Amino acid sequence: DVQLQESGGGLVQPGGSLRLSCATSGFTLDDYTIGWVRQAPGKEHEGVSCFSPSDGTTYYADSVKGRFTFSRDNAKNTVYLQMNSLKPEDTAVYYCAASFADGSSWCYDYWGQGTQVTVS
C-alpha cells in the first residue's frame, strides 16, 4: 500500500532555510500526485505544494510561492520541500501527501506521520 515518511523538521531561525524529505514505499511516483500539506494546532490544514504527473505542474499556496520549492528524485522515489525565508507563521507539522493520479483528488488520500517545523 502507499506509505510515506517525512523527515528533516526541527527548530530554525527566523528567515532561515530547511529541506524536508519524503521517502515513499509501495508505488512509482509518476502514478500519483504528491506534495506537502501543513497543519498548525488551532488552524485547519493548508496545502503547500502539489505536483501532477499529467503535465508536470507544481501548484503552490500563495503564502509560500517564491520561498518554498518542491522537487522529486524519481529514481529514489523521494520528494523534497526546500523551504527558504522561513517565517514564524510557517511553524506547523508538515506532511507529505499523495493521491492516485486519476483526476478525482490531489495530494489528499495518503499522508505520512508528519515532521514538525518550528521557526523562532
Author numbering: 1 to 120
The study reports:
In this study, we present a comprehensive investigation involving the systematic humanization, experimental validation, and computational analysis of two llama‐derived VHHs, previously identified for their binding to NKp30 and their potential for natural killer (NK) cell redirection (Boje et al., 2024; Klausz et al., 2022). During this process, we successfully determined the co‐crystal structure of VHH2 bound to NKp30 and obtained the apo structure of VHH1. Interestingly, our findings suggest distinct mechanisms underlying antigen binding and conformational stabilization in VHH1 and VHH2, determined by specific residues.
Despite efforts, a high‐resolution complex for NKp30‐VHH1 could not be attained. Remarkably, the predicted binding conformation of VHH1 closely resembles the experimentally observed x‐ray conformation of uncomplexed VHH1 (Cα rmsd: 0.66 Å, see alignment in Figure 2a). VHH1: The AlphaFold2 predicted paratope of VHH1 comprises residues from CDR2, CDR3, the framework region (Trp118), and all four residues of the Hallmark signature. According to the predicted complex, there are no direct intramolecular interactions between any Hallmark and a CDR3 residue. A 3D alignment of the predicted binding modes of VHH1‐v1.0 and VHH1‐v1.10 suggests that this loss is due to the G52W Hallmark residue mutation, which induces unfavorable steric interactions with NKp30. To further elucidate on the role of Hallmark residues and the non‐canonical disulfide on conformational stability of VHH1, we performed MD simulations on VHH1‐v1.1 with and without the disulfide bridge.
